[PDB]
Short mmCIF file of C-alpha atoms and ligand atoms in Angstrom, two decimals:
data_model
loop_
_atom_site.label_atom_id
_atom_site.label_comp_id
_atom_site.label_asym_id
_atom_site.label_seq_id
_atom_site.Cartn_x
_atom_site.Cartn_y
_atom_site.Cartn_z
CA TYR A 1 14.35 31.73 -1.72
CA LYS A 2 16.67 30.43 -4.48
CA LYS A 3 18.96 29.05 -1.99
CA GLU A 4 16.37 26.20 -2.43
CA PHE A 5 16.34 26.03 -6.21
CA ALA A 6 20.16 25.86 -6.17
CA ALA A 7 20.05 23.00 -3.61
CA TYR A 8 17.28 21.32 -5.68
CA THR A 9 19.46 21.55 -8.83
CA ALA A 10 22.54 20.27 -6.94
CA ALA A 11 20.70 17.28 -5.42
CA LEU A 12 19.24 16.43 -8.84
CA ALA A 13 22.75 16.48 -10.36
CA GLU A 14 23.98 14.16 -7.59
CA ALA A 15 20.92 11.91 -8.15
CA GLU A 16 21.87 11.56 -11.80
CA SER A 17 25.48 10.89 -10.84
CA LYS A 18 24.43 8.25 -8.26
CA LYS A 19 21.59 6.70 -10.42
CA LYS A 20 23.04 3.21 -10.16
CA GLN A 21 23.96 3.22 -6.46
CA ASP A 22 21.94 1.16 -3.97
CA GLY A 23 18.78 2.95 -2.84
CA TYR A 24 18.82 5.69 -5.52
CA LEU A 25 16.11 6.13 -8.11
CA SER A 26 17.27 4.48 -11.35
CA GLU A 27 15.98 7.64 -13.11
CA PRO A 28 16.40 10.92 -11.14
CA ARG A 29 13.19 12.64 -10.01
CA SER A 30 12.11 15.33 -7.56
CA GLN A 31 9.08 15.16 -5.25
CA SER A 32 6.11 17.55 -5.70
CA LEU A 33 3.60 15.46 -3.67
CA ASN A 34 3.35 15.85 0.12
CA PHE A 35 0.93 13.13 1.33
CA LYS A 36 2.84 11.74 4.29
CA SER A 37 0.77 11.61 7.47
CA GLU A 38 -2.88 12.41 8.19
CA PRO A 39 -3.62 11.00 11.67
CA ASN A 40 -6.55 13.42 12.29
CA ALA A 41 -8.46 12.93 9.01
CA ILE A 42 -12.22 12.38 9.06
CA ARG A 43 -13.21 9.00 7.60
CA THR A 44 -16.69 8.57 6.07
CA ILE A 45 -18.23 5.53 4.40
CA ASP A 46 -21.70 5.57 2.80
CA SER A 47 -24.59 4.25 4.95
CA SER A 48 -25.25 1.60 2.24
CA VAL A 49 -22.02 -0.13 3.33
CA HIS A 50 -22.12 -2.15 6.55
CA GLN A 51 -19.26 -1.30 8.90
CA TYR A 52 -18.90 -4.37 11.08
CA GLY A 53 -18.50 -4.69 14.84
CA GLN A 54 -15.54 -6.65 16.21
CA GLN A 55 -17.63 -9.51 17.62
CA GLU A 56 -20.01 -9.44 14.64
CA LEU A 57 -17.17 -9.90 12.12
CA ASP A 58 -15.47 -12.49 14.31
CA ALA A 59 -18.63 -14.61 14.30
CA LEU A 60 -19.01 -14.19 10.51
CA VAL A 61 -15.46 -15.24 9.72
CA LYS A 62 -15.79 -18.20 12.14
CA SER A 63 -18.96 -19.18 10.23
CA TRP A 64 -16.84 -19.43 7.03
CA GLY A 65 -14.55 -22.02 8.71
CA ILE A 66 -11.83 -19.51 9.67
CA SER A 67 -11.94 -20.40 13.33
CA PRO A 68 -9.42 -21.08 16.12
CA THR A 69 -11.12 -24.51 16.58
CA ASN A 70 -10.52 -25.69 13.02
CA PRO A 71 -8.24 -28.80 12.92
CA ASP A 72 -6.66 -27.54 9.67
CA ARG A 73 -3.65 -25.48 10.78
CA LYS A 74 -4.01 -23.25 7.71
CA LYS A 75 -7.49 -22.15 8.81
CA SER A 76 -6.70 -21.75 12.51
CA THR A 77 -3.56 -19.79 11.51
CA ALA A 78 -5.74 -17.72 9.11
CA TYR A 79 -7.96 -17.00 12.11
CA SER A 80 -5.06 -16.10 14.39
CA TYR A 81 -3.87 -13.52 11.84
CA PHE A 82 -7.43 -12.22 11.23
CA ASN A 83 -7.99 -11.83 14.98
CA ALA A 84 -4.89 -9.59 15.38
CA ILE A 85 -6.12 -7.05 12.79
CA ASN A 86 -9.79 -7.36 13.90
CA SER A 87 -8.68 -6.32 17.43
CA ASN A 88 -7.87 -2.75 16.34
CA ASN A 89 -11.17 -0.91 16.53
CA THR A 90 -9.81 2.36 14.98
CA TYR A 91 -10.24 0.59 11.59
CA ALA A 92 -13.49 0.41 9.65
CA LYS A 93 -14.17 -3.30 9.27
CA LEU A 94 -15.44 -4.25 5.80
CA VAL A 95 -16.47 -7.39 3.92
CA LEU A 96 -15.78 -6.83 0.22
CA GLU A 97 -18.00 -8.55 -2.27
CA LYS A 98 -16.47 -9.49 -5.61
CA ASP A 99 -16.82 -6.64 -8.16
CA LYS A 100 -18.80 -4.41 -5.74
CA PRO A 101 -16.81 -1.14 -5.25
CA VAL A 102 -16.71 0.55 -1.83
CA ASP A 103 -15.64 4.18 -1.30
CA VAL A 104 -13.80 5.36 1.80
CA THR A 105 -13.68 9.15 1.93
CA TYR A 106 -11.18 11.08 4.02
CA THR A 107 -11.75 14.77 4.68
CA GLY A 108 -10.19 17.51 6.78
CA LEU A 109 -6.63 16.73 5.67
CA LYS A 110 -4.20 18.96 7.56
CA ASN A 111 -0.69 18.22 6.26
CA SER A 112 -1.02 17.44 2.57
CA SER A 113 -0.39 19.28 -0.69
CA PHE A 114 0.72 18.93 -4.31
CA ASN A 115 3.09 21.51 -5.80
CA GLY A 116 2.03 24.13 -3.21
CA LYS A 117 -1.73 23.43 -3.54
CA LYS A 118 -3.52 22.06 -0.45
CA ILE A 119 -5.09 18.58 -0.65
CA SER A 120 -8.31 18.63 1.45
CA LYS A 121 -9.77 15.23 0.64
CA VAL A 122 -8.84 11.79 -0.71
CA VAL A 123 -11.27 9.07 -1.79
CA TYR A 124 -10.24 5.44 -2.02
CA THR A 125 -12.35 2.95 -3.97
CA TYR A 126 -11.83 -0.73 -3.06
CA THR A 127 -13.10 -3.48 -5.36
CA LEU A 128 -12.40 -7.15 -4.67
CA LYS A 129 -11.40 -8.74 -8.00
CA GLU A 130 -10.32 -12.27 -7.01
CA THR A 131 -9.69 -14.45 -4.00
CA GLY A 132 -8.65 -18.07 -3.54
CA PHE A 133 -10.75 -18.34 -0.39
CA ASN A 134 -13.91 -20.52 -0.48
CA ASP A 135 -16.19 -19.61 -3.47
CA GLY A 136 -14.07 -16.53 -4.41
CA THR A 137 -16.84 -14.09 -3.56
CA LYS A 138 -15.89 -12.35 -0.28
CA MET A 139 -12.89 -11.12 1.68
CA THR A 140 -12.27 -8.95 4.72
CA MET A 141 -10.33 -5.66 4.75
CA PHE A 142 -9.79 -2.85 7.25
CA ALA A 143 -9.77 0.87 6.39
CA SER A 144 -7.44 2.99 8.57
CA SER A 145 -8.40 6.21 10.31
CA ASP A 146 -5.36 7.66 8.53
CA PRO A 147 -5.41 7.67 4.66
CA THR A 148 -1.60 7.49 4.53
CA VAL A 149 -1.68 4.24 6.59
CA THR A 150 -4.55 3.25 4.34
CA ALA A 151 -5.50 -0.44 4.59
CA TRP A 152 -4.99 -3.95 5.85
CA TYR A 153 -6.47 -6.83 3.92
CA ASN A 154 -6.71 -10.58 4.41
CA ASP A 155 -6.24 -13.61 2.21
CA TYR A 156 -6.74 -16.35 4.88
CA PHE A 157 -3.50 -17.84 3.48
CA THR A 158 -4.97 -18.36 0.01
CA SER A 159 -4.76 -15.27 -2.22
CA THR A 160 -6.44 -11.91 -2.70
CA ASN A 161 -6.57 -9.28 -5.45
CA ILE A 162 -8.25 -5.94 -4.71
CA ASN A 163 -8.41 -3.03 -7.15
CA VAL A 164 -7.91 0.41 -5.65
CA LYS A 165 -8.75 3.78 -7.22
CA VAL A 166 -7.45 6.96 -5.55
CA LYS A 167 -8.71 10.49 -6.17
CA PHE A 168 -7.47 13.62 -4.42
CA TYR A 169 -9.46 16.86 -4.11
CA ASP A 170 -8.60 20.48 -3.36
CA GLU A 171 -10.34 23.00 -1.03
CA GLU A 172 -12.80 23.84 -3.86
CA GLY A 173 -13.87 20.16 -4.21
CA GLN A 174 -12.13 19.84 -7.60
CA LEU A 175 -10.33 16.65 -8.70
CA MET A 176 -6.59 17.27 -8.61
CA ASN A 177 -4.20 15.97 -11.24
CA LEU A 178 -1.09 14.89 -9.30
CA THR A 179 0.79 13.81 -12.45
CA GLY A 180 4.52 13.67 -11.67
CA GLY A 181 4.02 13.25 -7.91
CA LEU A 182 5.82 10.22 -6.44
CA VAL A 183 4.19 7.50 -4.36
CA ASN A 184 5.83 4.83 -2.21
CA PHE A 185 4.95 1.18 -2.84
CA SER A 186 6.68 -0.24 0.23
CA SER A 187 7.07 -3.40 2.28
CA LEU A 188 6.46 -5.68 -0.72
CA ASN A 189 7.42 -8.79 1.20
CA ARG A 190 8.30 -12.12 -0.33
CA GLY A 191 9.31 -15.11 1.80
CA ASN A 192 7.85 -13.74 5.05
CA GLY A 193 4.99 -16.29 5.25
CA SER A 194 3.97 -18.66 8.03
CA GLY A 195 6.54 -21.46 8.25
CA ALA A 196 3.64 -23.77 9.20
CA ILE A 197 1.92 -22.99 5.85
CA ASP A 198 4.45 -21.74 3.26
CA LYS A 199 7.27 -19.26 3.77
CA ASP A 200 6.94 -18.08 0.11
CA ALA A 201 4.12 -15.60 0.78
CA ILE A 202 4.13 -12.81 -1.83
CA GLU A 203 2.91 -9.23 -1.59
CA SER A 204 2.59 -7.30 -4.85
CA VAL A 205 1.20 -4.26 -6.63
CA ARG A 206 -0.44 -5.08 -9.98
CA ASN A 207 -1.90 -3.09 -12.88
CA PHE A 208 -0.44 0.26 -11.79
CA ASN A 209 -1.81 2.97 -14.15
CA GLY A 210 1.24 5.15 -13.55
CA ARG A 211 4.90 4.62 -14.29
CA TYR A 212 7.19 2.77 -11.84
CA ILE A 213 10.70 4.07 -11.17
CA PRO A 214 12.88 1.14 -10.12
CA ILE A 215 15.05 1.72 -7.05
CA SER A 216 18.62 0.57 -7.75
CA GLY A 217 19.44 -2.52 -5.68
CA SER A 218 15.84 -3.15 -4.61
CA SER A 219 14.42 -6.65 -4.56
CA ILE A 220 11.24 -5.30 -6.19
CA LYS A 221 11.19 -5.92 -9.95
CA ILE A 222 8.60 -4.92 -12.59
CA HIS A 223 6.68 -7.62 -14.47
CA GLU A 224 3.93 -7.82 -17.10
CA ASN A 225 0.76 -5.80 -16.58
CA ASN A 226 2.75 -3.26 -14.60
CA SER A 227 3.17 -5.58 -11.65
CA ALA A 228 5.84 -5.03 -9.00
CA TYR A 229 7.10 -7.78 -6.69
CA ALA A 230 10.24 -9.71 -5.66
CA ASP A 231 11.35 -12.80 -7.61
CA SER A 232 12.75 -14.63 -4.55
CA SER A 233 12.87 -14.24 -0.76
CA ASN A 234 13.52 -10.73 0.52
CA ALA A 235 12.72 -12.11 3.98
CA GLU A 236 15.64 -14.45 4.83
CA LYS A 237 19.36 -14.30 4.06
CA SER A 238 19.31 -18.10 4.29
CA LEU A 239 17.08 -18.04 1.16
CA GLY A 240 19.13 -15.35 -0.63
CA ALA A 241 17.82 -12.07 0.79
CA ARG A 242 20.30 -9.22 1.23
CA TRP A 243 18.72 -8.48 4.65
CA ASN A 244 16.27 -10.34 6.89
CA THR A 245 12.86 -8.67 7.01
CA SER A 246 13.45 -7.14 10.47
CA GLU A 247 16.68 -5.51 9.24
CA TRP A 248 14.95 -3.52 6.44
CA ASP A 249 11.16 -3.49 6.70
CA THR A 250 10.58 -0.58 9.11
CA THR A 251 9.76 3.13 8.61
CA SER A 252 13.14 3.88 10.23
CA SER A 253 15.54 1.45 8.48
CA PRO A 254 18.02 3.05 6.06
CA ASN A 255 17.63 -0.23 4.09
CA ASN A 256 13.81 0.04 3.66
CA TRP A 257 14.20 0.83 -0.09
CA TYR A 258 15.19 -2.86 -0.43
CA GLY A 259 11.49 -3.90 -0.40
CA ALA A 260 10.16 -0.85 -2.26
CA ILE A 261 9.45 0.63 -5.67
CA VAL A 262 8.45 4.22 -6.49
CA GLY A 263 5.32 5.01 -8.53
CA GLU A 264 5.05 8.18 -10.61
CA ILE A 265 1.43 9.35 -10.92
CA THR A 266 0.12 10.00 -14.48
CA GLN A 267 -3.66 10.31 -14.06
CA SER A 268 -6.19 12.15 -11.88
CA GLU A 269 -7.69 8.75 -10.99
CA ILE A 270 -4.85 6.59 -9.78
CA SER A 271 -5.38 2.83 -10.10
CA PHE A 272 -3.50 -0.24 -8.91
CA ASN A 273 -4.29 -3.68 -7.54
CA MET A 274 -3.13 -4.89 -4.11
CA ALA A 275 -2.39 -8.61 -4.50
CA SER A 276 -1.21 -11.28 -2.10
CA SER A 277 -0.54 -15.00 -1.98
CA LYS A 278 -0.36 -16.93 1.31
CA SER A 279 0.21 -13.84 3.51
CA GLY A 280 -2.67 -14.01 6.02
CA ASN A 281 -2.62 -10.27 6.77
CA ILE A 282 -1.27 -7.57 4.45
CA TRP A 283 -0.69 -3.94 5.41
CA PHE A 284 -0.88 -1.77 2.25
CA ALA A 285 0.05 1.85 2.91
CA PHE A 286 -0.39 4.40 0.12
CA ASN A 287 1.52 7.64 0.66
CA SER A 288 4.28 9.91 -0.68
CA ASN A 289 6.89 8.71 1.88
CA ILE A 290 9.32 7.42 -0.70
CA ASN A 291 12.19 5.27 0.60
CA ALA A 292 14.66 6.10 -2.19
CA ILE A 293 17.81 8.11 -1.39
CA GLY A 294 18.56 11.60 -2.77
CA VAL A 295 15.11 12.64 -4.06
CA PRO A 296 14.87 16.43 -3.51
CA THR A 297 11.59 18.26 -2.88
CA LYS A 298 10.71 20.38 -5.93
CA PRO A 299 10.50 24.03 -4.79
CA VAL A 300 7.38 26.14 -5.39
CA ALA A 301 7.26 29.61 -7.02
MG1 MG B 401 4.46 -5.60 3.62
#
């Protein structure tokens, strides 16, 4: 009733008091966005886009030199990583062409809402912008059955930069403005690379068209062109990390804020770039499951 609004006001007061403590939002906020888990969404991609078979894509990537037979350990390691993600056939398997957008549309959302209004549909647009691999023209990614799990992409241990647009729609098919809703940019690993290639792999979010809220104590810092990443290893204590990757980078760790930053939405069309260097495989989840401590849910009406 108002029991809630009182608890909301109390938690917000505590959040301002504990601003500077590890894991708290540096600026207190509440959460109006509920976009947490959608395991039974319907995924649709336009017939113009080729959704690859497992063997088909395997042969194609091998044809580019990313093969288990390649004498260059970088390329055979690139393959090994690629094979692991290509083995999950619940993903839609895509080859992105540079500057050619691809929409992945999720419908029949069951669990999601913004400020009491049901979210029925979310559309992701993926556009490869740059890659260090071969002639810079193509790269593989994998679109999840669940829009909150979202995507894996590759860089074949070079680098990749993919723009993502996100648009959410209500029951009436209208574009929703989720301004003020909070999104989780999580698991932004640095230093978790292949020791055979380069441990200093870097996962980042670039060109975010919202406003980041730094999490106090987090390894993830903001940089020019609204780009969030760590400045040194958050993977190994022996290279300065507070925790080894396995101690913080899970959905269940109380330390998982250590590799995270919060994004506050400011536009109906959300935009950011997923970017990696020397990572092989990158899991990029986009959801409202913020890792920060003491963020109350904003009550409705
Ligand atoms: Mg990660």
